[model samples]
Target: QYGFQFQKKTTDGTDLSADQLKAMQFNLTQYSDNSFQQASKTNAITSTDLQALAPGYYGIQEAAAPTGYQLDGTTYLFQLTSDGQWQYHGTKDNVTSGSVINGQQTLNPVGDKSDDFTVTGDHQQILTLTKYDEPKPSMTLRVIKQDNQSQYLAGAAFTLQPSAGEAETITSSATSEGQAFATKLVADGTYTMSETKAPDGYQSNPAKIAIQVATTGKEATVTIDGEALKPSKNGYTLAIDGSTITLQAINQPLAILP
Candidate 1:
């Protein structure tokens, strides 16, 4: 995954082993539910009906583009399908052009008509198929307020810190329930998090939470008591796993002048 590309070049008319042939059959069978797949090399994969090899699980890649026009600029319209009909769906993402397989079919169909496909494209097109299977990072954070005696504090104001020098702050208000915190991280790595401000009753130290970025999720906790320290304005920060709950202060005081 270190910026290296791996290509699986497909060839046409090659004799399929039991495993390869079975993959073909599986595609053909799932014709109706066509979905976009994330692939490293879209061109390198073949679109064919291997139903004869493994008829139940696979289906053939048929042209789903409109009948008159070529699919994504390729004339063959080589994509797998269960219904054997080519029609445009919706635009969920940007369209990929040339030497691309657009859709898939059902896993089983009433009739079995299959056409096996081999990879037929130039090296330049093959390079586009090189893709990194990277997962997007996401997270959540919470701010809380605490006194000197309690073990935990709730309701706080916090901000998510990006890499140094970049001043984009993802900030959120702490929930009263303090249930689940939700945020999206960029990638998997180490990150710094902290509380931005404190309430008017208790004093808080600037807490720094170091987090190991993850693709999935994680959590952190802080506690405070209401004794010893009096009339203090403070908040704390905790570095927790993805998606966090904010700590908040209850019954905070507002200043006035006569």
Candidate 2:
């Protein structure tokens, strides 16, 4: 029903060797308790190594990148479905299904590059981690949309108002989790990103998320409601790469949101 697939490509699109994959370790944790679910006693974690789990949230991460590749220590968050689909939690666009090569299904396809998330034979599949060199000095002010459950939500619209400029507005794509990667490194100053309209089923979040963009590569912050956004609190997660800040903004569904 639900599953995950694997493939590693560097910035140049070269596939990671099968030998190197054997030593690559993948780690999984249940979001309910943030407990380690499966341990790689032998240092390799395969797709089949994890069984279909209960509903909620789950995070899978590379325990370590290959020999010399840079590890951003980023956790690929997702929700698994039993129907051959892995719902990307943060709108990961590169997620591809497993493809059949000879008699086995793997991400490192030799000829056929077909993918849709289903395992062919003795193969496993969800996220394909990046095999990269390094990140460039680019600014990205990303806001991810999610519900109170922390599941990535689509269809919300947001506006970013600069302290001294025209306001900018963009709606979260209906197909992607609010990852509208459009905002650039703004003129160093104060800004506020607020949800003007939320999805039909969820109530609009009416908080002016404070955005502090100081000197480039210096102090930058995103605080929602009244708390520092982090995984441990505020029901959100944050990743600050230099001046780039990716924050998850959550809303409450209408069912009990009165």
Candidate 3:
């Protein structure tokens, strides 16, 4: 008999209660008979077992998940070996378990007592299907002024264009040390940040900043005209971790004629 407990939880190992699990629905599809089964609404756990069959193939699929949970569209497949072994199949890779010895082929073992077989994976007795709530991936962009020091600048406006979506405007605000920052970037998205407006008395950099945000972090590079900008510890350059890119705007001063 195959028994499984279905629960909703985050990646942090927080388990949902029985009342919460009851609100969600779970169903399974059997490949052998093309039949579908729904989990009992009264219980947080469900159990099912395969019937006796000859050496062949079979599959099971999680047809639906509970409300607010993402469906795990995976079909678990397995095969019954003639040698009294059950072989796991599908994306879980291939694994087998049986008590039949290779040299015993001459006698050929049979019956439940002759050879006991069970299927397992990763040390688990039953297959566990998980449903995740949702994933939130974000990143932060820091904008600063180009002075040899780590001094930040304000009043700089930028238009961010993602690699595959509409453009968004991100403006820098004057905060501690005069630096500007945007922290609402989506993860795994590549974006282009171009200066739409520069700070007062400072020229706008014609170069564009390309930022590649990952699920946990981000990296960026600056480019002007048609060439790449090199790294600079005190000037316009890409940062070491590739997360910060600086743009230096030349300050213009009034010229006096003699």
Candidate 4:
């Protein structure tokens, strides 16, 4: 398995333009038919795909229904960006039903359509109504050998924890190169962090960190210290400065994408 991911944003930052934003608004029309056209059967109508469909200040938003309605999986909420390339946002999973091309495998419309189409039942949409707006929030946690060293811990294990027993933590370790792992913050709050396990050729040295979260336009730095297996480890000199972790806030609308 590719690991379990919580309901949050992924770090694939891209900025869009005004024309691009307009394209996104119009792209919703492309799905007006509810069913996919034979010509438009590639990736599902993902935020990234929608971004490609239109342009402008766009994001994967929530567009849901009341309660009893059935939702077709084809629905999704997207926004326009300031740049030309639409940033592929995220998606929602609470879908009721989907419009099926049941007849001759042709486009059989079911009526329930928006970003989402429905088969039967009341009106639960694909996405709800909430989503990320202009200034989104982002955070990262880096792991290192406590200092700048040529050597790296390949298969070390680590977990990102918020406080001592908080379950909303993202875990990752060194990827053959000393670097930081990425995670997203849904809202503003205080967070606690803890790491587990030691890298190859190193012993287990666990540590904790504290973070103050906010909406958009804020950054937090977390420096983690990885320890050696034994007191006689050769790289003790390399473990000088500990690990330097820096987190920056990004909220400006993306512009000029390649």
Candidate 5:
């Protein structure tokens, strides 16, 4: 990710796997002359290469759309300072440097002599390239059943209700894996989970828990009971191997007194 990257992700922000390069199309214009410097060869690495850009201004826009997503036509302009600092003052930055000109930004190292396209386009076109060749992720969750003492327990039951699709029942058994039961889930979405039955003799955790897993961002976010889970917060752990994410839900058991 040293240079520029056109991340392949679903509209929901779920990252598609590698080699899902969809078009990688763009339009790069030099601010000095408003002239386009895009490669003469189509789809060449040089077409989108981000090398030692001159200390001028530049703007890049999505010229094509990817499958399962929409096109983004707004040009994002940035400046390569003489000292090599990326000068991208965003609207969030409340940066009042220059204004928008031609299609590029107005960071005239010269209006301090001159000049940039008046690129105008909307970014809400439906992508219809068809056939999503990227791998559709199948998420797996490892559920742990235990007491407040952290002793592995069994006979716990759960029913995971997804935002969409039918509910799936997962039972925590006296498994070989220290009382942890693993199950599969759809790639990304929210799920309402509840411990239908607690391990025999332990106080039941019948609380309805809302859990959401998302890969829409740089890192996957998992929330439990509406709170985002940390690496080791209250017994929850999230780990990633390769590109897959594995989560462990550690149950705190409370023993019943006779």
Candidate 6:
């Protein structure tokens, strides 16, 4: 009679709608010898009685995290007690049954009379993962100011154009220590950054900087004006790396209006 009903929900406690729940699956298994032995795989379960298993440890995880949720790559640990209890290790809380069994025992209970003591009642194990909006892959475009190739200037303006999206207007602002930056461009899709305005005392470069946005954490292959932008400062800091783009304008420059 000892059983478990798997429930899916967000870490915020919002239960997944019945329609979205259909795409989710759970993988349960025995944990032993630093490895897992698959025990069961199901898309849904309702207070399912775990076959009188040897009182031991077990683990569970989503076969793959559902869309809109972070990948719960962690395997949660639990244990079945000889006294007929399902104890989860994460919160040190009893997951199933009525008796209170501490996670102290490690060896499996063997032999007959095992199925004799059944845990009957409503026992539910809720699996939770953080829910997030689908990633909107995008990139940031920066326009730096330099009057003499060795110094910084400010008050430059520009217009950024994408291969397939609306144009964005950017204006450089001052950043103490003499450096300046445009309002900054955050675009999704492929785009090019070009100057539309110049600083009061500098000549704006009319060159277009090409950029492409993609999923984070992958090396970005980007080029501006036919020359590939080499990865700088500990690798590709342009396109998605930690799931966001931190692009810097290294090819665009402005010189003093001499």
Q: Which segments of model 4 are wrong by more than 4 Å?
A: 1-135, 145-149, 163-182, 221-258
Alpha carbon lDDT of each predicted model: 0.31, 0.52, 0.43, 0.31, 0.46, 0.44
In model 3, the Cα lDDT at residue 157 comes to 68
Q: How big is the positional error of residue 25 in model 1, measured in Å on the Cα after superposition? A: 26
Clashing pairs in 2: 1-82, 1-83, 2-81, 2-82, 4-125, 4-126, 5-125, 5-126, 10-131, 97-117
How does residue 107 of candidate 3 score in lDDT? 14
Q: How close is every model to the real structure, measured as TM-score? A: 0.31, 0.40, 0.41, 0.30, 0.41, 0.42
Candidate 3 off by > 4 Å: 1-139, 146-151, 164-166, 174-188, 212-222, 233-235, 240-258
Q: Note the residue pairs that clash in candidate 5.
A: 13-216, 102-117, 102-118, 103-117, 110-113, 147-253, 148-253
Best-matching candidate per TM-score: 6
Error of 1 at 139 (Å): 3.9
Query: For residues 1-258, could you state the per-residue lDDT of candidate 2 as single tens digits?
Result: 334445554552445565345545666655542232333222335533545444435555667655434444545545544443344443123433322222222222222233222233234333443323232133567777777775777767778777765787776653333564555644346777778687788876666677775544345566767755543244345667665676676677776634
Question: Candidate 4 vs candidate 5: which has greater lDDT?
Answer: 5
TM-score of 2: 0.40
Q: Point out the worst 10-residue segment of candidate 5 by lDDT.
A: 124-133
Cα deviation of 39, candidate 4, in Å: 52
- Minimal lDDT window, size 10, model 1: 125-134
lDDT of 1 by residue, 1-258 (tens): 001112211222223333332322111222222343332222222333111211111122322321111122111212322333222222224322313333322121112322212222332111112111112224554444444544344444445555543533433333334433344443344455555554444344354555454433332222233322221233433333335433343333444559
User: What tens-digit string does per-residue lDDT give for candidate 4 at 9-123?
Assistant: 1112223332222322211323222222222222223233312333222222223211212222333423222332111222233421332211111111333211221122122
Ranking by lDDT: 2, 5, 6, 3, 1, 4
Candidate 3 lDDT, 1-258, residue by residue in tens: 332333344442435444344444444333342121222222123322323345544443334443323444444444444554544444223322322322221111222112112334443333333334332334555554442244445566666777765676655544443333443455556667677776555565666666665545443333444555445422344434343443343322223469
Candidate 3 backbone collisions, by pair: none
Total colliding residue pairs, candidate 2? 10
Candidate 4, residue 201: the lDDT equals 41
The 10-residue segment with the lowest total lDDT in model 2: 101-110
lDDT against true structure, model 6: 0.44
Q: Which regions of candidate 2 fall more than 4 Å away from where they truly are? A: 1-138, 148-151, 174-177, 227-233, 256-258
